[PDB]
Swiss-Prot record, chains A, B:
Catalyzed reactions: RX + glutathione = an S-substituted glutathione + a halide anion + H(+); prostaglandin J2 + glutathione = prostaglandin J2-S-(R)-glutathione; prostaglandin J2 + glutathione = prostaglandin J2-S-(S)-glutathione; prostaglandin A2 + glutathione = prostaglandin A2-S-(S)-glutathione
Species the sequence originates in: Mus musculus (Mouse)
InterPro entries: Glutathione-S-Trfase_C-like, Glutathione-S-Trfase_C_sf, Glutathione_S-Trfase_N, GST_C, GST_pi, GST_superfamily, Thioredoxin-like_sf
GO cellular component: cytosol; mitochondrion; nucleus; protein-containing complex
MF annotations from Gene Ontology: glutathione transferase activity; JUN kinase binding; protein serine/threonine kinase inhibitor activity
GO biological process, one term: negative regulation of extrinsic apoptotic signaling pathway
Protein name, UniProt field: Glutathione S-transferase P 1
PTM sites of type Phosphothreonine: 61
Binding-site positions, glutathione: 7, 13, 38, 44, 51-52, 64-65
Domain GST N-terminal: 1-80
Residue positions, PTM N6-succinyllysine: 102, 115
Localization per record: Cytoplasm; Mitochondrion; Nucleus
Enzyme class, UniProt record, top EC level: transferase
Phosphotyrosine modifications at: 3
């Protein structure tokens, strides 16, 4: 530490790392970049892939939100107890990222016309996660193993925004509904989710959700 | 071990992990799924995300090409000397994945009409890797640290298929050109790249490259 998140004023790709830091009792500095500032073009050319999030952990500057998430998993001890678990956490986080990729394209490229087709195809995309939970202690623990990982925080965020998009999407997925309820109730996540910083922040930049 | 890769008969998302295994002196089995068998629809429901590659390592079954690569990186000691390196290698590999995703979209959905635009945009996408390399020992070693890692194989594969798509795209990138040349001359990669198995396998599934 110290931790600094540099990002646009939206939840987007930074709300899972914010929830992880909050639930682990860490504090961080939030460096908000407004669109006017981004459009001035001084910040972008200093960013490795010209995009945000940018994260600082003391000495180390990182880019790519999943690299930042895996870094926090590795350094805060949220990456499983052994290689098999870590391999499975990666498979989970990668599946999360694929659906987050589709969600971002719906929101920003085709909200109006794509929405009903997205939501109709959503159960087939949520089913893998329900299968993984049943296979792990009947869905009563975390997505991989007995302890929380970086992957849980990223999956919870993905499910929380899909419930805003399609309110009953978890009605036929009992283990995922219970998982969402369970993890949201964790004292420090529950507190973070009720914080004005989280609440005043839009999910996406274009007003859709 | 044993190692088994279950994939379509194309290079696609499995040629980087094949080069990694070959260079680390491992043997593996290829279970080839043809497109006509896949379209019968019997194997797809058994895949966690309905997709291939599927990888078997002894009794661990994995899906997601980057989870498989990170797994091999972790089990074979190709993930750096410390946490700082490990985070940097993930940042590199997520940057490779972003460009691979763009490449896939070009190839399968918009080749004839998007190629010129892609190639014009490509220098701005390769410049980060050139910069990373110049900061790591003036580009004479690997992408991160002084030992090869899973990210080097994924980056090498990305640049090799881009040299097919846009011959001479590395002309303005002296360090990436020297890098490709250096890693391609590693005797076990050199053997793999001239093997008929590799040579006769198409880069992509739709005849474009
Ligand atoms: C206006 C607020 C809403 C937009 C927020 C969308 S995420 C922002 C976008 N960055 C990314 O898409 C980063 C993707 C990267 N792969 C990651 O995982 O971190 C960006 O920096 N875009 C700036 C650019 O490309 O110029
Ligand atoms: C189609 C013939 C040529 C395709 C070669 C490209 S890989 C095929 C595609 N798989 C993927 O896109 C996997 C992406 C996944 N994120 C990964 O990294 O493993 C698939 O299984 N597609 C089958 C499906 O979706 O039904």
């Amino acid at each position: 530490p110290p931790y600094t998140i540099v990002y646009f004023p939206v939840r987007g790709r930074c709300e899972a790392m914010r929830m992880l830091l909050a639930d682990q009792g860490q504090s961080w500095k939030e460096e908000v970049v407004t669109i006017d500032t981004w459009m001035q073009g001084l910040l972008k050319p200093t960013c490795l892939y010209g995009q945000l999030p940018k994260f600082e952990d003391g000495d180390l500057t990182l880019y790519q939100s999943n690299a930042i998430l895996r870094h926090l998993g590795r350094s805060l001890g949220l990456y499983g107890k052994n290689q098999r678990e870590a391999a499975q956490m990666d498979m989970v986080n990668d599946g999360v990222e694929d659906l987050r990729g589709k969600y971002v394209t719906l929101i920003y490229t085709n909200y109006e016309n794509g929405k009903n087709d997205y939501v109709k195809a959503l159960p087939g995309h949520l089913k893998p996660f329900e299968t993984l939970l049943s296979q792990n202690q009947g869905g009563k623990a975390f997505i991989v193993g007995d302890q929380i990982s970086f992957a849980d925080y990223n999956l919870l965020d993905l499910l929380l925004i899909h419930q805003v998009l399609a309110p009953g999407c978890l009605d036929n997925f009992p283990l995922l509904s219970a998982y969402v309820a369970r993890l949201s109730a964790r004292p420090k996540i529950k507190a973070f989710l009720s914080s004005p910083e989280h609440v005043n922040r839009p999910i996406n930049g274009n007003g859709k959700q």
